[PDB]
């Protein structure tokens, strides 16, 4: 599991002012790796397929309601022509 390395370790005694070829040490945190929990991708409760099914069912319900509105609102011209024509004839009777 350990990444491979030709050099095990050596003894280095750094100074402050004369760090020549200023490197970038790999910093490490101080909290134990036991507190650093492993990652888990929390899967969503629903799937996009179930989303499609539910949204399509809702679209079917909305379309049924819109069709009901259409059949109730398509007769209004029929009401117009059923109500005024007898009255227009009555006015013509004068």
């Amino acid at each position: 599991m350990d990444p491979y390395c030709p050099f095990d370790a050596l003894d280095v005694w750094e100074h402050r002012r004369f760090i020549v070829a200023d490197s970038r040490n790999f910093i490490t945190p101080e909290f134990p790796r036991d507190f650093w929990m492993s990652p888990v991708f929390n899967l969503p409760r629903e799937t996009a397929a179930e989303q499609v099914v539910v949204l399509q069912a809702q679209r079917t319900a909305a379309a049924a309601a819109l069709e009901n509105a259409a059949m109730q609102a398509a007769e209004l011209p029929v009401d117009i022509e059923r109500r005024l024509r007898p009255i227009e004839r009555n006015v013509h009777e004068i």
């Binding site: 909290f31 507190f35 650093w36 929990m37 990652p39 929390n42 409760r45």
Partner: protein, 99 residues
């Protein structure tokens, strides 16, 4: 613990509470310092107090919270860099007891 808020999970509040129980058993790796208010004002003012430099204005609190995380978020705690966030201390009595 005291800075993260989660989501409802469409549950019976028993299993939903239940899982929170064991996730809480180890959620705090250490002492959350915000529960240590038994100390007197003398102990509080002392520089060994860590939360001193997280108190700069009476109207707000200063604290560490997950960064780049929208609250509330998924109940499983996301891991990110710790950052500093502040809130409104509306209640004047919410000022720390030593103060």
């Amino acid at each position: 613990f005291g800075v993260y808020v989660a989501e409802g999970t469409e549950d019976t509040l028993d299993v939903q509470m239940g899982r929170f129980m064991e996730t809480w058993a180890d959620m705090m790796p250490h002492h959350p310092h915000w529960v240590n208010e038994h100390l007197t004002i003398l102990q509080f003012i002392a520089p060994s107090n860590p939360r001193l430099r997280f108190e700069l204005n009476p109207a707000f609190d200063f604290f560490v919270a997950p960064g780049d995380v929208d609250l509330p978020g998924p109940q499983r705690p996301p891991e990110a860099m710790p950052t500093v966030n502040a809130t409104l201390r509306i209640i004047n009595g919410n000022i720390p007891v030593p103060l």
